[PDB]
Structures are given as structure tokens and as C-alpha cells.
Symmetry: C4
Subunit: 92 residues, 4 copies
Amino acid sequence: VGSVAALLTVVFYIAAVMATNLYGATFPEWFGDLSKSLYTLFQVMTLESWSMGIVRPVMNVHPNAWVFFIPFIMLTTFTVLNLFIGIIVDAM
Amino acid sequence: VGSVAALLTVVFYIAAVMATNLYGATFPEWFGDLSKSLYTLFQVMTLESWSMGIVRPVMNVHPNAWVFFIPFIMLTTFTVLNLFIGIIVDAM
Amino acid sequence: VGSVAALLTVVFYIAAVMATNLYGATFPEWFGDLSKSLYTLFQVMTLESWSMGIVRPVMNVHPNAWVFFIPFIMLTTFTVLNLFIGIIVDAM
Amino acid sequence: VGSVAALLTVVFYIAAVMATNLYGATFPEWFGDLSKSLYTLFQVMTLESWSMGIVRPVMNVHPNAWVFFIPFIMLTTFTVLNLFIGIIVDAM
Ligand SMILES: [Br-]
Ligand SMILES: [Br-]
Ligand code: NA
Ligand code: NA
Ligand code: NA
């Protein structure tokens, strides 16, 4: 469980650094600093307004933004589910 | 199953009291009384418009609001999933 | 699996009849006929805009609407998850 | 796991071709080409704004659009969950 939880933290910090660099200047409310980026990527992970609210407005400036966000979703959504199931099975 | 269901009820009432106190005055439609608070925190748990609809408007007045909401989500989303899986396994 | 799938169909039709009757006149686009109601309740089940998009506008006319929708969500979200897990385990 | 992952890829490409053909002319931002279609159908799968954001605007032009989208959701949401659970069990 600890290895999976540490993997997600490292992935979350690398992604939030990457997103600050890529979309910070063009989208400062969502990715203007590391803290705004970490909060936004958490929102993207929970799936909340990920496309209509964040990704589509971003893609109008950065067409390839889907190469960042879609894999981020596919990985974090799998890892979180694997972490929760892992913690539940270990507690049993 | 009963212990997990009781844990969530106690956590839900403490959070909705806390939210009434913190955000009630500045956001009365969402946290103006305990009943509005319990409804909103349920909506936050289901992930529905949690960030674009509630948390981002709140953070514009209370910058640290994420310290309340993010852990609330992480805990309730884990507990509910643990309660549903627990009820399914016990029925088998 | 068949018993769970039949339980959800009966619950979905009873709810969609109830919602047509209760909210049809005041909210015709969402519950004006049985077909619009069945579609809306499916959207409510997937959690999509359930509160900001449907339930909050409804509650402004019908304050108690949460007594219908919250249990509907709690039941269908549990049943669907139980049906999917049940179908997966039976296939193994 | 490989058979389930290949089934989803074939289903995703057939659906995105079908959606390009059906809704491309009337809704070009969402289904104007295969690339836009594949992105939108992924967003529909994650449940993000599927009804208020995409399906309801589409249904105002194509009333039967629900015959495409509802089964697409029911199938992909089941398959993805079956793929993730399958990958987790195989890793154990
Ligand atoms: Br989470
Ligand atoms: Br479903
Ligand atoms: Na959602
Ligand atoms: Na969801
Ligand atoms: Na939403």
C-alpha cells in the first residue's frame, strides 16, 4: 500500500510541475503556481469538469493538451482505485 | 458494516456543523444552516460540481478552504466505497 | 445477476413514474413525460449535474425534492455497483 | 486483460466513426472529425458533462441520440471497470 501511495505522490508532483510550466502563463488561475496546479490536477483526477471546465478551454490554446491530461486521468484513476482496493484487502 | 456506517454519519454531521460555521455567512445558499450544509457535503461526496460549482467560488473568499474539502473528499469517497464493498462481501 | 437487474428495472420505472407526477408540470424538459423522466433519472444515477443542473433548480420550487433524489442515488449507485461486481464474479 | 483492452479499442474506434458520421455536421466542435469524436467519447465515458454539456444539446437536433450514448456509457463504464479489476486481480 505504501509503495502505491508513494508512486502517486511522485507522479502528482511531477505532473503539477509539468502543468505549471506548460499552461501557467496562458491559464494562470488553474496552473499559475505549483499549489494551483496540484489542486487542479486533483480536480481532474476526481473527474470534476475536467473536459468542459479545464481541458477544452486549454486545448483552444494548446491543441495537444490531451496527450498530457488523458494519460494523467488513465494512470491516477487506475492508481487511486488500486490504492483503495489494496488498503481494503490488507485491512481484511 | 454497522461500525463503518456509524463512522460516516458522525463524520458527516461534524463536517456539516464545521462548514455551517466557516462558510455559512459568506455562502448562505450552500452552508447557511445545517440542512443546506448536509445536502452540499453529500453533493461534494458524489463529486458533482465540487470544484467549479462550490470549492473555487468558496476559495476566492477563504483561500485555505481546500484543507477542509480535499480531506473530506478523500475520507468520504474511501469510506463509502469501503461500506458498499463491505455490504456486498457480507451478503455473499 | 438476473434478480438484481430486474430489481433495478422495477425501481427505475416506479421512480420515473413518480418523478413525472411530482415535477412534470413545474420542470417539463426534465420530467414532462415518462421518457424524459427515465433519461433524467439515468443522468442522476451517473451523477452528471445531479445537484447544480437538476436537484437545486427543482428544490427552489419543491423544497423536499432531496427526500426523492438522495435515496434514489444511494439505492441505484449501490445496486449498479452490486450488479457490475456480481456479473464480473459470475464470469470468473 | 489483453482481450478486454482490445475489445474496448475496437468498440471505441467504431463508436467514434459512427458519431463522426451522425453528429459531425450538426455538432462540429464535438464530432467534426475522428480525433474530436474519440476525445468526446472518452469524456462521455468518464461521465463528465455527458448529458448537460453534450447529449441534451445533441438530442435537440437528433431526438434518438440516447439510443447511441446510453448503451455506449453502459458498455464502456462496465468494460473499463472490468479491465481495471481484471488487471488488479492478475497482479495479486
Ligand atoms: Br480520491
Ligand atoms: Br451505468
Ligand atoms: Na462528475
Ligand atoms: Na464519477
Ligand atoms: Na459535472
